[PDB]
């Protein structure tokens with residue numbers, strides 16, 4: 001009981017319009033920090049790289065069941081099937097993403113089991129072999145971190161692994177350590193994000209993830225930062241949207257166009273300056 005998913009807040013963003021998101025996301029519609037392993041790698045190649053990077057840390061074996069909490073448009077799961085031959089289960093609070101993932105699953109010609117549920121992790125209690133979550137944690141809310149890890153720990157096998165990929169904000173002290181000032185623009189931009197882009201969005205700090213996951217019984221076998229990659233990922237998304245300005249205005253409006261350009265370019269500065277980080281936490285039971 002209780003802890004019912006924050007559908008409205010999350011949907012206010014991801015259910016805007018698939019057509020709109022298609023204007024700037026790479027073809028796989030991955031919506032999270034990419035990983036440019038080769039300097040001249042395209043956004044799609046870098047997104048696939050980030051996918052494989054996360055998946056390869058799980059120790060996936062044929063026949064296992066992989067749970068993707070906050071699966072987005074399903075590229076990660078579809079890639080997990082082809083590259084690791086595992087069955088997949090995806091959770092998302094986005095109606096458009098659920099419909100899209102389902103459709104894409106139907107069009108796949110694989111024997112592996114695959115389904116997507118319009119539900120939060122808080123509503124999922126099925127046993128699974130491994131868990132991947134990329135860019136979803138930031139939406140969970142600090143007040144639910146503890147319960148999140150408890151559930152992940154509960155549904156994973158005794159030697160299960162959780163790959164938690166999430167944006168992390170520097171503590172106030174870390175910012176001071178890095179000589180990053182608390183400017184009016186920063187506070188203003190953050191309020192903007194929370195008000196017009198990601199309501200309910202509360203990125204954790206690094207220590208929050210470590211401490212909370214440790215309390216549950218997870219061991220952090222590795223934390224890997226992709227900070228420099230997000231600024232670039234963000235620039236590419238911003239540029240694509242800008243290249244589709246007229247299409248964006250047609251599908252939505254100039255207001256929405258400008259809102260997203262403001263959000264995309266603004267965040268690119270956050271990572272570029274270093275106010276925000278993005279990390280992959282390999283958590284083992």
Ligand SMILES: Nc1ncnc2c1ncn2[C@@H]1O[C@H](CSCC[C@H](N)C(=O)O)[C@@H](O)[C@H]1O
Pocket residue numbers: 005006010014029030031032069070071072073076091092093094097119120121122133134135136137139140
């Ligand atoms: N409590 C919750 N339970 C399950 N999914 C959640 C959630 N809060 C947010 N999400 C999901 O997390 C995703 C954030 S967007 C990231 C999508 C995908 N993992 C990718 O990397 O491209 C959305 O699919 C959103 O619906």
Ligand SMILES: CCCCCCCCCCCCCCCC[N+](C)(C)C
Pocket residue numbers: 031032134135136138139167190193194198201202203234267270276
């Ligand atoms: C690309 C998004 C960058 C957000 C940077 C930090 C801004 C302030 C905190 C907002 C928290 C919400 C994060 C939602 C992340 C959603 N996506 C995974 C799809 C990018």
